[PDB]
């Protein structure tokens, strides 16, 4: 329950509702609504973890200098993460403008199986990243 795992819980949860892509869903995604609102998640989520890792540093017991810039490698990754989501959704709105008015199902269902695979991507670097985080401090 660290302040940057509960922001990354709310980025998770709010993620999870875009991956029904429900009808709001589908409303939010051609404005740029839920790119915006992610963008403020993933934001926060990377405020707080660096403002923990800073104060993590204020508890430690070479081997600091890997062990920081393997920290850093990991926060990187889960901020790209995020980015490389958003970045797809903002893709699927291109996507749906260049059909013209035709059909957007079958776009919807490549989106939601590239989705999937984004967010496992996002928790395993998450996941790792705690590891490194608790065994940091
Ligand atoms: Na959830
Ligand atoms: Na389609």
């Given at each position: 329950g660290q302040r940057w795992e509960l922001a990354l819980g709310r980025?998770?949860?709010?993620?999870?509702?875009?991956?029904?892509?429900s009808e709001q869903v589908q409303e939010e995604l051609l404005s740029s609504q839920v790119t915006q609102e992610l963008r403020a998640l993933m934001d926060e989520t990377m405020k707080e973890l660096?403002?923990?890792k800073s104060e993590l540093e204020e508890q430690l017991t070479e081997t600091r200098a890997r062990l920081?810039?393997?920290l850093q490698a990991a926060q990187a990754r889960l901020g790209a993460d995020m980015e490389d989501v958003i970045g797809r959704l903002?893709?699927?709105?291109?996507?749906?403008?260049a059909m013209?008015?035709?059909?957007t199902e079958e776009?919807?269902?490549?989106l939601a199986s590239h989705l999937r695979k984004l967010?496992?991507?996002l928790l395993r670097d998450a996941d790792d990243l705690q590891k490194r985080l608790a065994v940091y401090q």
């Amino acid at each position: 329950g660290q302040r940057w795992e509960l922001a990354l819980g709310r980025f998770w949860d709010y993620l999870r509702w875009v991956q029904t892509l429900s009808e709001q869903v589908q409303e939010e995604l051609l404005s740029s609504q839920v790119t915006q609102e992610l963008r403020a998640l993933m934001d926060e989520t990377m405020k707080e973890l660096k403002a923990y890792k800073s104060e993590l540093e204020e508890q430690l017991t070479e081997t600091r200098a890997r062990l920081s810039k393997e920290l850093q490698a990991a926060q990187a990754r889960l901020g790209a993460d995020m980015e490389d989501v958003i970045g797809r959704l903002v893709q699927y709105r291109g996507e749906v403008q260049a059909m013209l008015g035709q059909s957007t199902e079958e776009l919807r269902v490549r989106l939601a199986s590239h989705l999937r695979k984004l967010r496992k991507r996002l928790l395993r670097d998450a996941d790792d990243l705690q590891k490194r985080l608790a065994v940091y401090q």
